[PDB]
Amino acid sequence: ADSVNGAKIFSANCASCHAGGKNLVQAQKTLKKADLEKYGMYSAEAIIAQVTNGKNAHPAFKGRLKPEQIEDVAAYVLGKADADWK
Ligand code: HEC
Structure with missing residues (x-):
């Protein structure tokens, strides 16, 4: 996969809710490593799954x-x- 392109996808599709790696509307569930780990989301397969089909009422991007x-x-x-979201 392509991290650098992913930045662009992230800015257009995710940053409204996850600016800075945070979670503007549900502060408990950020994109920081510790929160991803806590929720079993610290893997490419987990993130892909969340974003694709959107369960837990998450936006779906398929x-x-x-x-x-x-x-x-x-x-x-x-x-x-x-990188701790720089
Ligand atoms: C609001 C309109 C959002 C947009 C656009 C995207 N996300 Fe999101 N995300 C949102 C909420 C309300 C939550 C918490 C509830 C839940 O379903 O988990 C999340 C959570 C995630 C997570 C898990 C984070 C964690 O558990 O700590 C991930 C990995 C995630 N979101 C990724 C993500 C990506 C890649 C997005 C764009 C493609 C994206 N989200 C958009 C709300 C919203």
Whole structure:
């Protein structure tokens, strides 16, 4: 997958709710590494799944994003989390 492209996908599709790796509307569930771990989301497969089909009422992106773009934003998210969202 492509982290750098994922940044772009993230800015257009995720950052409204997850700016800075945070969660503007549900502060308990951010994209920081510790919160991803807590919720069993610290993996590309988990993130892809969440974003694709959107369960837990999460926005679903299958309609508007290609698989490859979903893979890309997931790798982006994991990279950022590892870097503590800079
Ligand atoms: C609001 C309109 C959102 C947009 C757009 C996206 N996300 Fe989101 N995300 C949102 C909420 C309200 C929650 C918490 C409830 C839940 O379903 O988990 C989340 C959570 C996530 C998580 C899990 C974070 C954690 O458990 O700590 C991930 C990994 C996630 N969101 C990823 C993500 C991505 C990649 C997005 C764009 C493609 C995206 N979200 C958009 C709300 C909203």
